């Protein structure tokens, strides 16, 4: 009480943050592109500014935790935290991050197929695995790994973002049981997350297998995980029946298909990530090494 937690409220002052455009609303919050121009000389730096969509007390608390998580991370494949803006006369919070111009990897793969080949896909796979290795060192579980939640800086560099669902593992357990569930990205969830609300490094590995599928399906649209799973379940189904069917499918070895053109060896990596036995899933370190060995073993 006596002394409140450290904050640097003069680092990004709201009067010097100029709104340019909204970049989106989604699972990532409401994010705007702004320019931070403290010298008011139409110089400065374009930044990404994350805001809450519903500023309830609970969401503000969760936002503080997300900010602390992001502040703690420094890695080439993690979107760079810049600071916080205590806007509305220091009665609101906005999160300041670096701006990456190409947006989500999901959108980049659709918009920029002219510059994507399997070599690039494996480079992105490697980078995502290394960022996830780094999260593991902090006992952080991302819980929303998907190409929509990875940003593209340029054709040679991707970075995880969207730490809005990230949790920190209890000191003495290897999983976090989420006991307030909200909207769930069910088609990326491991079976134990669907059936027991249990999240772990190994459930992030399951989701990474879905990301790897997404990368290798990029040539098509009918092939996204939601579309393919709904085709398998039955496109007519609605509501909880969808989840019931997805659980039953996954528990009895139902899986997304090998994308057209995908090497057998890459599909094998996906399949090994999609193991119902949590402990048999590979680690992010196993995956990074295997993917980089595959890359290195090509001719040249
Ligand atoms: C934190 C951050 C975001 C960022 N850049 C972009 C760029 C783009 C691409 N726009 C650019 C302007 O013209 C049209 C194409 C974009 N589209 C959306 C929906 C988002 C929002 C977003 C998506 C995924 C994730 Cl993980 C986090 C997000 F905040 N963004 N965010 N840099 N840093």
Author numbering: 833 to 1132
What does the paper say about this structure?
Janus kinase (JAK) family of nonreceptor tyrosine kinases consists of JAK1–3 and TYK2 (tyrosine kinase 2) that serve as triggering kinases for cellular signaling of over 50 cytokines and hormones in regulation of blood and immune cells and metabolism. MPNs are clonal neoplastic diseases initiated in the bone marrow from a mutated hematopoietic stem cell. All of these compounds are type-I inhibitors that target the conserved active conformation of the adenosine 5′-triphosphate (ATP)-binding pocket of the kinase domain and show variable target selectivity and differences in clinical profiles. Structural analysis showed that all compounds anchor to the ATP-pocket of the kinase domain of JAK2 by making two or three hydrogen bonds with the hinge region.
Gandotinib binds to the hinge with three hydrogen bonds, one to main chain carbonyl of Glu930 and two to main chain carbonyl and amide of Leu932. In addition, gandotinib forms water-mediated hydrogen bonds to Ser936 and Asp939. Pacritinib stabilizes a collapsed G-loop structure in JAK2, where Phe860 is buried within the binding site. Despite the collapsed G-loop in the gandotinib structure, the Asn859-Asp994 hydrogen bond remains intact, and gandotinib displays low JAK2-selectivity. Interestingly, the binding of pacritinib and gandotinib, which both form a collapsed G-loop, is driven both by enthalpy and entropy.
